[PDB]
């Protein structure tokens, strides 16, 4: 009833990839194996497996148990950004759930035609922020080097009716020295990034 081992520890893929998640268990009085999806904090129940070689299939998600090999697979086909989560394996030993430590999956949009740009946005009322957007998912946004400058990580938004996803990060500051031209200087951004006047 001791241990559940998950693999890989973490995985980053583009949308459309198939991923395979593995769970092995060493538990006395093993009864069943469960898979959960934890997007943020609260786990979502996916599958319970008790018999070997019987696939459970929930759309693009599927799972199967092999009691002889003491292991289970969770397969996700044609991944979507919304699949990004920690996936948890747990074994039931007739007494309690024994949780694995999880596999972190991140799925990034596959930006076919990047249009990297840093736009300056003004306040509806009366500071200002800089918006770095439309870059490809391999671009990395560095945190700020100055504690009076704030820079968020990249974030994916989905304009669902347009079948259009895009990355962006936000920077702001009230410092005099701060400008969209230099906002993301601690990051490596494309040489052809659009900087409006």
């Amino acid at each position: 009833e001791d241990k559940v081992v998950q693999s890989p520890l973490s995985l980053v893929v583009h949308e459309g990839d198939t991923v395979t998640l593995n769970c092995s268990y060493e538990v006395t009085n093993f009864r069943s194996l469960l898979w959960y999806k934890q997007e943020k904090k609260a786990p979502t129940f996916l599958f319970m497996l008790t018999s070997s070689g019987i696939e459970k299939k929930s759309g693009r998600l599927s799972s199967i148990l092999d009691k002889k090999e003491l292991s289970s697979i969770l397969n996700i086909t044609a991944t979507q950004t919304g699949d990004s989560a920690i996936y948890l394996c747990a074994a039931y030993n007739t007494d309690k759930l024994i949780f694995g430590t999880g596999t972190r999956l991140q799925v990034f949009p596959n930006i076919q035609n990047p249009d990297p740009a840093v736009y300056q946005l003004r306040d509806s009322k009366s500071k200002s922020v800089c918006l770095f957007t439309d870059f490809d998912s391999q671009t990395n946004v560095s945190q700020s080097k100055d504690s009076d400058v704030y820079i968020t990580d990249k974030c994916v938004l989905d304009m669902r009716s347009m079948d259009f996803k895009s990355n962006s990060a936000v920077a702001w500051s009230n410092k005099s020295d701060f400008a969209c031209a230099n906002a993301f200087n601690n990051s490596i951004i494309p040489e052809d990034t659009f900087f409006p006047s």
Binding site: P43, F45, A117, S124, V129, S147, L157
Partner: protein, 241 residues
């Protein structure tokens, strides 16, 4: 829709008696209380296989429970300690399927020596660049929530009086405004992207709302500034041609 709990966020003082409530609308016999901590995952505090039944889990110390009714599992912290700061998750399962546990949304509890640092956010909306509009035929609004403590907020976008989800991305993690400080206040950004044609209709009204979880009516406050109660703070803009 499955299992439900107390408020999603709670801030309390060290030494205070704290009550967390799990309520399920699934008619399940089994209920479970867990905490969830970085590096440790889920640890079982207490569970109940039926009405008026309870059994200690792996880490019951410092906790009490009661199962007075089938739909409700109460967790009690007799004297809140700072190391009971955690994410508390309740689950339930039907009889005969004890292991298929359905989790509620959880309650994030922060326990502090005092609440003098609690601050609601300021909220501001920033309007789309004309350059983005002509270059991409799209328009991104940004909402900034700043200066708040603790990191207990929920941000939403409201377009023409109705909440929207499409075209929205909110930072999953806040920024510390003073990362070198233990009690740094926080900042959070969100984006809402719409078509240029939608943005260019000035009848369209956009509101960024931040629900802040702060003090309750019963909490004491003797400082000069306004009592940092649970509250909504918002900012708004209209489209522009």
């Amino acid at each position: 829709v499955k299992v439900t709990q107390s408020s999603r966020y709670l801030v309390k003082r060290t030494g205070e008696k704290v009550f967390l409530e799990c309520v399920q609308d699934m008619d399940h016999e089994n209920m479970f209380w867990y905490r969830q901590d970085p590096g440790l995952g889920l640890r079982l505090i207490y569970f109940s296989y039926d009405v008026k039944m309870k059994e200690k889990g792996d880490i019951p110390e410092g906790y009490s429970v009661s199962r007075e009714k089938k739909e409700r599992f109460s967790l009690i912290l007799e004297s809140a300690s700072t190391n009971q700061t955690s994410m508390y998750l309740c689950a339930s399962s039907p009889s005969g399927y004890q292991e298929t546990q359905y989790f509620g949304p959880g309650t994030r509890l922060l326990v502090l020596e005092d609440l003098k640092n609690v601050f609601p956010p300021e909220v501001a909306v920033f309007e789309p660049s004309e350059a983005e509009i002509s270059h991409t035929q799209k328009a991104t609004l940004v909402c900034l929530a700043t200066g708040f403590y603790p990191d207990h907020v929920e941000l939403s976008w409201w377009v023409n009086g109705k909440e929207v989800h499409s075209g929205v991305c909110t930072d999953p993690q806040p920024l510390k405004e003073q990362p070198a400080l233990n009690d740094s206040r926080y900042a959070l950004s969100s984006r809402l992207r719409v078509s240029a044609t939608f943005w260019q209709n000035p009848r369209n009204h956009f509101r960024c709302q931040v629900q802040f979880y702060g003090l309750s009516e019963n909490d004491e406050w003797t400082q000069d500034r306004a009592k940092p109660v649970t509250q909504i703070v918002s900012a708004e803009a209209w489209g522009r041609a």
